[PDB]
Amino acid sequence: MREIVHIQGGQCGNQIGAKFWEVISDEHGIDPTGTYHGDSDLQLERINVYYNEATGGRYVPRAILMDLEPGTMDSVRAGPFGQLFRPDNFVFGQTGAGNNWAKGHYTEGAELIDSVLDVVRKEAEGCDCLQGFQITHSLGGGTGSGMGTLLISKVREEYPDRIMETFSVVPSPKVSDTVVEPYNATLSVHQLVENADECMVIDNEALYDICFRTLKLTTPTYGDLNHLVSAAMSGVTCCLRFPGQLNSDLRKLAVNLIPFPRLHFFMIGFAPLTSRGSQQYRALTVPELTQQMFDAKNMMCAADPRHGRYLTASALFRGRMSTKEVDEQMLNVQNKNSSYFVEWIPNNIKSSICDIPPKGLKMAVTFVGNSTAIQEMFKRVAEQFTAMFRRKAFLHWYTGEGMDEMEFTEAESNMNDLVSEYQQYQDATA
């Protein structure tokens, strides 16, 4: 019944997926031991989208766990909800990636991808009717970036018509934790546009910014940042698992958000968000949810969406509500901000309603937008890349695995052309 498998790699990918399965399990009322303890039957009707079936009535997720070192999967197994993961699904190497794109994409990635791909093939064919793939990985790391994009190339070759979703984390110059990030970031972005149907950029600079400003919590931790990402992940596929006034799956959103096949980079946000000391003073209504949704500071990306023009946008609503206000509120925001929407695509906003809100809430909104302001991320990354590349700094590591400068050269041109393409469509009038 159009289920989707989960794939995650690297340290950043593993931690995001470690909390995503925690939120979903709470959403469907699955205890850490694997037993259903819900209240309503709607929680159990469409459980097959994520969970398989085992003896004794326990449910097991169809998640695949990959990394080139055993250190990370020791932590995910010891954490909460860690007994819900298949011991056979774990596939690990004993060497690591060393923050090197070449090492994780040519030498160890090639010699390990055979084992993980067999798990993917067995997991995918077991289901009656597949729906697509979703991947969580980081573009600043070694094994998340290198072998992670190698699997994407292999999967797209064997499963052509399926939908490929990627919750990607690119590095920002402000909060930097690696000197060699521009190399393995640009090389992955060139590969990402090759095959991925949908790309959803995430920045730690933006996620930190929300915690200091919006939630007003003094000491944020990676566990707090993972919760915001996991909340948005379940939102985009909310209506695929529950009834609603209007239905929308992953394929439907791709149709209404991709004017051209190469323009498949989205920026996402979630509402509502309020600090603990300010929750009692806020009234939750459809006007309030949509007011926070378009706010620039609410995005999970470092790009400012008011520096460019939206091409397409989408909004998914959770909980019971009236279709009259939902229709008119999207109408009002389009009329008041006609300068921020390009003029050759009238009615460039999508609405969807699911009647089951997230656990512990009454109304929730997930936003996915295609904007031409995302290009300033690739501009600043390529700005740092060319500064290092003109002096051939750190290049002896990459050349040591057979990769030549031609791959570096063609990564520059393809990245520049993608940036040049976004600007041209923003600079277009009827």
Binding site: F90, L217, T274, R276
Partner: protein
């Protein structure tokens, strides 16, 4: 904007001085009730902080510990619920059963 002083002498009792109003002002009674409530709350916990005014600042806030369904239930933060001893070897690795292999299979 004023020093709340109450004593037997009427010229410095405020309530005696501010009785010219057409009604009973809802600041003095609220303050007295707050003082009594803070005293009782301190008795429940036990503070005796050399004066009642020290704990009065944070005994009046209505902030609930948990969320009230207007934001994600992430709590007050991971760092809030963390305890720290400092014995040597406290944070050593555990090597759970998933990665603890023994026999090193030879064939493929």
């Amino acid at each position: 904007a004023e020093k709340y002083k109450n004593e037997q002498e009427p010229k410095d009792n405020t309530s005696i001085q501010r009785s010219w109003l057409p009604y009973k002002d809802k600041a003095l009674q609220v303050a007295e009730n707050n003082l009594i409530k803070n005293q009782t709350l301190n008795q429940t916990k036990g503070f005796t902080p050399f004066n009642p005014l020290i704990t009065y600042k944070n005994n009046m806030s209505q902030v609930q510990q948990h969320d009230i369904a207007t934001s994600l239930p992430i709590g007050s933060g991971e760092h809030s619920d963390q305890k720290r001893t400092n014995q040597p070897g406290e944070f050593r690795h555990v090597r759970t059963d998933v990665t603890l292999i023994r026999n090193k299979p030879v064939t493929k």
